[PDB]
């Protein structure tokens, strides 16, 4: 119930909160109804982060969210969706850039009290900050006012990601994933009560719908810091709760879980270096295969790194058939988690063949690698080939292979690529 005026903040200026499409929103917005910008986009803008290729904006309007979203989508030429208190979305997709605009209802007799009331229900204080669209677009002699009753700005200045209330986390448990992800993504420290809450009941996440769970999970696999978030989820037992198979990696000692985590961690680096190992023709369409509509085959690759050996706990001196077992397990997880059919099949096929480049490498070191094995390789799997290459390199690194052996693997890959490029006609 108290405002404060500050000067030189320069991140809170309406100018900073601007987006071109907001104009279109304002033109679709009815005259007698109001609209606010909330959460993620506000948070990122306050932090002064440069806007990337993925733009997500959340709205709270007193108008009809469905009609608003419909006509706005008609204006920007986007796809209009309705799901779920029914919030409506607008997605706009071109290959380098993705746009998503969510529209949520805001109702009450007192508008300000209602807005605050809604902000206090949100997951984290950083995401609890909102601004009026009119104030943002209001060109002249207009001061812009930001609303954070939860003190999100104060927490952002101190570099803390603090849940508004633990009850808000218990109400929608999938947010406990976001808390980790964002904490790594925005380089913020999660406060004490979050860590405590988490420890006590890690399985809480199972309350939330599966699809939502899946969606966040990929969102984690989407960022380049993903291995850290995955390790965080594993150490606190959340990952085991979501995927019980992962917990079984611990019973088998060589440590398998550490090997998988390091496999993912190295896989990120290898992905960054992919231009080095992969051929140009393999790099052209790499990462361009769309999965679950906002995600690519790269997330599937990282999932492949997590599951690359999931079958070693099932088989027990030497682990023989764990590739096929792993493939089946992955298929089961993909069904359970409602991953796309072609997605779970992709990851499954990736896990099935995960040790193939190692065999071809062993054949390469003995000089016994010839046209037969290569042609057989490219015939059997040509679709997962680049992903399988990167995965194999990462797995080789995490296994602590000798440098000459890793280089032998890389040269094996290069030989397969060169054989496929020219000498296959």
Residues tagged in the binding site annotation for CTP: 40-43, 122-123, 127, 172-181, 212
Residue 10: exposed, middle, or buried by beta-carbon count in 10 A (0-12, 13-18, 19+)?
exposed
Give the distance between the most distant pair of CA atoms in the chain.
80
- Distance set, CA 260 to CA 97, 133, 305, 383, 391 (Å): 32, 46, 7, 23, 11
CA distance 83 to 72: 17
* 89 torsion bin: left (phi>0), alpha (psi -120 to 50), beta (else): beta
Is there a contact between 266 and 398 (Cβ–Cβ < 8 Å)? yes
Binding residues for Mg(2+) are: 56, 58
Q: How many alpha carbons lie under 13 Å from residue 120 in its C-beta half-sphere? A: 7
Is there a contact between 162 and 194 (Cβ–Cβ < 8 Å)? yes
How many C-beta atoms surround the C-beta of residue 262 within 10 A? Answer: 20
CA distance 128 to 34: 18
CA distance 291 to 283: 18
Residue 52, C-beta contacts closer than 8 angstroms, at least 6 positions apart: none
Question: How many helices (DSSP H) and strands (DSSP E) are in the chain?
Answer: 23, 9
The partner residues of 115 in beta bridges, in order of sequence, read none
Binding residues are: 40-43, 56, 58, 122-123, 127, 172-181, 212
CA distance 234 to 188: 19
Residue 188, C-beta contacts closer than 8 angstroms, at least 6 positions apart: 126, 156, 159, 160, 161, 182
Interruptions in the chain after residues (C–N over 2.5 Å): 84, 254, 316
């Amino acid at each position: 119930n108290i405002e404060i005026v500050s000067s030189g903040k320069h991140t809170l200026h309406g100018l900073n909160f601007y987006l071109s499409y907001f104009d279109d929103v304002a033109k679709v917005l009815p005259r007698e109804h109001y609209c606010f910008i909330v959460g993620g986009w506000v948070r990122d803008r306050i932090l002064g982060e440069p806007v990337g290729y993925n733009i997500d904006v959340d709205f709270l309007t007193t108008a009809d969210p469905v009609e608003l979203a419909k006509n706005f989508a008609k204006r920007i030429g986007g796809h209009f969706f309705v799901f779920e208190p029914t919030i409506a979305s607008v997605v706009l997709h071109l290959p380098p850039y993705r746009y998503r605009f969510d529209f949520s209802p805001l109702k009450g007799k007192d508008l300000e009290k209602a807005l605050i009331e809604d902000l206090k229900e949100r997951d984290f204080t950083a995401n609890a900050i909102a601004v009026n669209l009119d104030d943002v677009l209001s060109i002249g002699a207009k001061q812009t006012i930001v609303y954070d009753p939860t003190g999100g700005i104060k927490d952002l200045e101190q570099g803390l990601l603090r849940p508004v209330s633990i009850e808000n986390l218990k109400r929608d448990p999938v947010r406990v994933l976001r808390g980790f992800r964002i904490a790594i993504e925005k380089n913020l420290q999660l406060t004490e009560d979050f860590y405590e809450f988490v420890k006590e009941d890690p399985r809480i996440v199972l309350k939330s719908a599966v699809e939502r769970i899946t969606h966040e999970l990929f969102k984690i696999m989407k960022e380049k810091t993903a291995h850290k978030v995955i390790r965080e989820l594993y150490e606190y037992g959340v990952l085991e709760a979501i995927i019980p198979e992962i917990g079984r990696l611990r019973e088998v000692k060589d440590p398998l879980d550490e090997h998988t985590l390091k496999t993912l961690e190295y896989l990120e680096q290898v992905i960054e270096d992919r231009a080095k190992y992969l051929s140009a023709e393999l790099l052209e369409n790499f990462g361009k295969k769309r999965v679950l509509g906002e995600f690519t085959d790269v997330e599937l690759l990282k999932w492949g790194a997590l599951f690359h050996d999931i079958g070693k706990p099932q088989t027990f001196v030497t682990f023989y058939e764990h590739d096929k077992v792993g493939a089946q397990i992955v298929r089961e997880i993909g069904e359970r988690l409602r991953w796309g059919d072609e997605a779970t099949e992709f990851v499954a096929k990736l896990v099935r063949h995960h040790l193939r480049p190692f065999f071809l490498r062993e054949a390469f070191k003995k000089g016994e690698l010839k046209r037969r094995g290569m042609a057989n390789f490219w015939r059997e799997c040509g679709d997962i080939a680049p992903h399988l290459f990167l995965l194999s390199i990462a797995d080789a690194m995490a296994s602590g292979d000798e440098e000459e052996d890793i280089k032998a693997l890389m040269e094996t890959i290069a030989e397969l690529e060169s054989f496929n490029r020219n000498e296959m006609k």
